[PDB]
Symmetry: D2
C-alpha cells in the first residue's frame, strides 16, 4: 500500500487540475506546490542564456560548496511537456546539487501547447550540446550527465539517444520517466486514477504536446522503440510503485540492459509519481536524491 | 512456475521456427503440430465459400450432435496473421463445437505476407456479416458470436468493433489475443523468450502483416486504442500466465469493463500462449474449452 | 481494476461486520446476503444425517434432473469456520448441481467458536468417508469429488490429504481457498482492506477457530506445509484477482503441480473473494460455476 | 529479466552448495566467494571482544577516514544463520564504512548448527547493547544504527524489536532480509530455483538453525508476526527483484509503515539475493551501498 503519509496527503486534495482548468491556472498551481519546498543553500546560482538552434534558452546554473573541478548535470524538469519551469524546480535542483557535489544546469525548454513537439527535444539537445562544449565555463571538466523527471526523463532519455557519437555523456538519470505511448501495461491500467498523475492527465499532456498520432511513433517521443539502444550512457532509472508510468520505465531499463548498457533500476515502493518534488514531506524523496548523489559522485569523482 | 508438463514439452524442442525458416516451412511445421490433436466426432462438417468483398472466402462449418436450433460461433484462427488455417484448427474447432453445442464456422481469412493488413480484417468482417445474414442456412437462429485465438483474437475483437450498429453479435471470445502494439508491458518483457511465442516471433509477424508503422495506430490492428468501446458484445477473455501477450489482453478486458461491457477475464495460470491448441497434452486447454462451452451455452440457450 | 459492478456494490455497504458484531448477528447478516440468490430447480432435495465420529452431521443432498448414474460432489461451505451453513449455500449448491449434472452433498460441519479446530476437519472427513461408502444410496457410482469455498476450500484440501490411500477422490475443487497462515504475500498485504474479505476478518476467524498458535503449523489447518502432496486428486483451483487469499491459493496450485498432481489454476480477474456466492449480480460467478461444471462432467462422465 | 551480467555469472556455476556438501565445505566456498572482493582502505581496523551474556563475542571495528564524531553502525552478516563471518564480510563492511563515513562494528554472532536459535539473536542483541553503552570508545556519540543482510537482516530487525525502550537505535537497515516463515508468497514460489538463494537452501538453513517448528512462531525468528511494530527505528529496506525473499521483505516494510514507522522500501530490479556481497561485479550493489551511505549520513550527521 501507499505510505500512510502519502495517502493522507492525497486524501486532502493535493491535485493539479490538469485538463480541468486553464493552462495558466494549472501552471500556477504547480508552481506553488513545487516551489514551496525549502531552498537549500548552494555556493552560487547564475541565470544564463544558451544560444539554441530555434530559441535563446534560459537555464539556471547551481554551483556546489565543494571545490572544483566538477561534473555538470544537465537537468530537464517534468510537467507533462506543458507545466513546470526552472524556477518551480529550484528546490529540487538545489537538493540535487548538494547531494552530488556537482554543477547542475536546469534548462527552461520550450513548452507546449505554445511550442509543440519536438520543440522541447530540440531545446534540450541544443542546451546539452552547448553545455558540453562550454564545460570550462563552470569548471566542469569532469564531464556531463543528463537527468530529468517524468516528461523531463523522457527528454533526458531522448537527448542521450541523440547524443550518441557526438557528446560524451557520462550518465543518464531517468526519474519516473515517460518513455513512449502505453495503453497496455498493468501499472498504467491499475494506477490510472487516484495516484496524483492520472491517465486523464497523461492523455491531456499528450494532446497538447504532440502534433498528430504519427508523433507517437517518433523515437524522440518514444525512446523505447528506438532502433538501437547500444552505446548509450550508463543509467540510473527510478520508478515509483504506484505510478502509472512504472512499468514502462522498468521496460526501458530492461531494454537498455539487453543492449549492453549498464543500468541500475530501482523501484521506490509505497510512493507515487512525482515524489522527489515533494521531498520535504515524503522522506523517500530525500533518499532518492541521495541515490542520485551517490551515482554521480562515483561517475564524476570516483568518490563514495 | 510453468506446469512441469509444459516445461518438459518446451525443453524437448516444441518450437515453430518463425523468422528462421521459409514461410512455407513454418506453415508446414505449425500444421503438423496443431493438426496432430484428435478430431472428435461432430454431426456434420461442410466446406463452404463465402462471397467476400475482396475474395471468395473458404470456411468450414461444424454441426453439433445436439438438435437445433443453434447459435453460430464464427471462429478466427491464430498464427500471427501468417500461419495457421482452417484445417490445422480442425481439432480445436471440433472440440469447441462439442463443448458449446453450437455450429462453428471457421474462416480461412487471407494471410500475410501475400495479403497484408487489413486483408484479414476485411475477410473476417465480411464472413461474419454473411453468416449473420445467412443464419437460417445453419438452423442458427439463436444468433451469432465471434471467437479467435491470438492473431485470431485480434481479428475477433476488431470484428466486434466493426460490427457495432450493424450485426447483433451476442458474444466475443478472445483467447490470448493480441490487441495492439506493446513495447512496455511486464509480461511482454518478462516472457519475451523461452515460452513458445517470443518477442522475435511477434516482431516478425508484425513485419509480414503490417504495411507501415502507421498501421500500428489503426484501430483495426490496435483495438485497445479504439475511441469508443461501449456497446460491444459481452466478452470472455482468456489469458495465459506465461504469455508475453498476457498483460495487453488483461488491459483490453479492463478497458471493456470501463466502457460498461460485461467481461469475464480469466488468467489460466502455469501455462503458455497457444495452450488450447495443445489440449490433448495440456489439460488446462480442455478446461478452457469447457469454459468457452459454458459461456456460449448460457448466451445462446440459457442452459447450464 | 475491479469490475465497476463490484466497485458499485462495495461502495454501497455490502459488508458482513465480522468481529464488530455478535456471532449471532454476523451469521444472520451472512445468511440474508447469501440466501437471497435464486434457488434454481433441481430434481430432488433430501436432508440426511451422517453418523460422524464426534457428532451426527446434517447434510443436504441435491439430485440433478439428468438421469443417473451420477458422480457425487461433497461440498464444504465457506464462512471463516464460523459463519455460513448448508441453507445459506443452497442457491450456490443448486447452481453447481445443475452445472455438473451430479449429486451434490453439502455438509453442515461443526462451527467455531462453539467447536474449535479440528472439529470442522473431522466432520468434513467423516462425511466424505461415509458418502464414499454409501454412493449406492445416491445412484452415485461414478465416484466422489470434494469442493469448497474459502474456509470450505481449506477443508476440502485437507480432506483430500487425509483421504490419501483410503478413499478414491476423483477431483478436488478449491474455490478461493485459505491454505494456511500468511503474513507475507503481496495479495494479503495489498488487499487487506476494502475488498469484502479483510485481514481483520481473517484474523478474527483465526482467533475463533484455532485453539493456540501451534494449530497454525498443523497440516490440517495449513495444507500448504503438508510433507507430501503427491498422489492427491486432480485439482481445479479458482482464485480472485482482488482477494487477499489469492497468492496463497496460487502457491498451493504450484506446490501440487510440483508434486505431480494435475492442476488447473485459474485467476478470475476483476473480482473479489466470495464472488461465486453472489452469482446473480456478479456474472463472472456464473462462469466460474460453469467451469466447475465442465471439469466435473469430464471427470465423472467423460462428457463435454 | 536479470541483468545479463548476472545471468552470465549464474550460468557459469556461481553456487554455494548448501545442503549438498559438509558445513565446513560450504563455509569455505562462501568465504572464498565473498572475501575475493577488494578491501577498500579505511582509517583503522580493530578486533574487539564484547562480553555477551552467553559468550565472548568477536567483533571487527572499522573507522572511516573522515574525522569524528561518528555514528556507529552495528552490522550483522548474512549466511543463513550457518555460514559467513566477520572476515568474509570485510570487503562489504569496508565499502559501507567509506560510504557512510561512520564506524562499522561487524559482529561474529554464534552460528548454527553448533549454536541453534536463539543464540544468534542473543549475541546480536548483547553486542548492540554493549556498543550503545560504549559509544564513547569509538568517538561514536552521534548514535547507533543496526544493519544486516539476509539472515543478518532478520537479526537486525529482531534486535530493533528487542531494543524498544532500552536502546536508542537511530536507524535499521534491512538488506534483502528474511522476516519469518513463508510458504505462500509469489516471489518465494517463482524464484525458488535458479537465482542463487534457493528454496532448498532456505529450508536447509531453517533445519540447522531452528530447534523445532514452534520456533517458526517466535517473533525472534519471525519479526513479521510481532505483536507491536510501533515505535521502532526508521528503516531502509532493500529487496531484490529476483529474490525468493523479496515479497516478505516488502511485506515487512508495509507492516512497519502501517505501524507509523518511517520506511524507505526500495526494490533493486534485475538483480538477485546477495547482490551487495558481489559489488565489484554487480554495479547495482555499489549503488545500494551508496543508498545506505546516504541514509546514514543524513540520520547521523544531517549531511547530504
Ligand atoms: C508525463 C507525460 C507523458 C505524456 C505521454 C502521452 C502519451 C500519448 O498521449 C496520447 O497522444 C495523442 C497525440 O496527441 C492523443 O491522440 C491522445 O489523447 C493521447 O493518449
Ligand atoms: C500474435 C501476433 C501479434 C503481432 C503483433 C505485432 C506488433 C507490431 O509488430 C511491429 O510492427 C511493425 C510494422 O510492421 C514493425 O516495424 C516491427 O518489426 C514490429 O515490432
Ligand atoms: C477464510 C478463513 C481463513 C482464516 C485464516 C486464519 C489465519 C490464522 O489467523 C491467526 O491465527 C491465530 C490463532 O488463533 C491468531 O493468533 C491470530 O489472530 C490470527 O492471525
Ligand atoms: C536466509 C535464511 C532464511 C531461513 C528461513 C527458514 C524458514 C524456516 O525454514 C523451515 O524451518 C523448519 C524448522 O527447522 C523446518 O522444519 C523446515 O525444513 C524449513 O522450511
Amino acid at each position: 500500500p501507499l505510505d500512510p503519509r502519502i495517502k493522507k496527503l492525497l486524501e486532502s486534495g493535493f491535485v493539479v487540475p490538469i485538463g480541468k482548468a486553464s493552462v495558466d491556472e494549472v501552471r500556477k498551481i504547480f508552481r506553488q506546490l513545487a516551489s514551496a519546498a525549502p531552498k537549500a543553500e548552494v555556493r552560487k546560482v547564475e541565470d544564463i542564456k544558451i544560444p539554441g538552434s530555434e530559441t535563446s534558452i534560459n537555464a539556471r546554473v547551481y554551483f556546489p560548496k565543494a571545490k572544483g573541478p566538477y561534473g555538470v548535470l544537465v537537468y530537464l524538469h517534468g510537467g507533462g511537456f506543458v507545466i513546470g519551469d526552472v524556477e518551480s524546480y529550484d528546490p529540487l535542483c538545489r537538493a540535487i546539487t548538494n547531494a552530488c557535489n556537482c554543477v547542475v544546469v536546469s534548462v527552461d525548454y520550450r513548452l507546449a501547447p505554445e511550442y509543440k513537439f519536438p520543440s522541447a527535444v530540440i531545446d534540450s539537445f541544443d542546451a546539452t550540446n552547448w553545455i558540453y562544449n562550454n564545460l570550462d565555463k563552470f569548471d566542469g571538466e569532469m564531464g556531463i550527465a543528463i537527468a530529468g523527471d517524468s516528461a523531463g526523463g523522457n527528454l533526458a532519455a531522448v537527448v542521450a539517444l541523440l547524443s550518441k557519437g557526438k557528446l560524451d555523456l557520462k550518465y543518464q538519470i531517468l526519474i519516473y520517466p515517460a518513455v513512449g505511448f502505453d495503453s497496455v501495461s498493468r501499472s498504467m491500467i491499475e494506477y490510472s486514477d487516484g495516484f496524483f498523475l492520472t491517465r486523464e492527465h497523461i492523455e491531456w499532456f499528450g494532446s497538447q504536446y504532440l502534433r498528430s498520432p504519427a508523433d507517437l511513433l517518433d523515437f524522440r517521443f518514444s525512446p523505447i522503440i528506438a532502433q538501437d539502444l547500444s552505446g548509450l550512457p550508463p543509467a540510473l532509472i527510478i520508478t515509483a510503485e504506484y505510478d502509472p508510468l512504472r512499468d514502462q520505465g522498468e521496460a526501458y531499463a530492461n531494454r537498455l540492459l539487453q543492449a549492453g548498457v549498464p543500468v541500475t533500476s530501482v523501484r521506490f515502493n509505497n510512493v507515487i509519481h512525482g515524489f522527489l518534488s515533494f521531498f520535504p514531506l515524503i522522506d523517500q524523496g530525500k533518499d532518492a536524491i541521495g541515490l542520485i548523489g551517490s551515482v554521480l559522485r562515483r561517475t564524476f569523482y570516483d568518490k563514495s
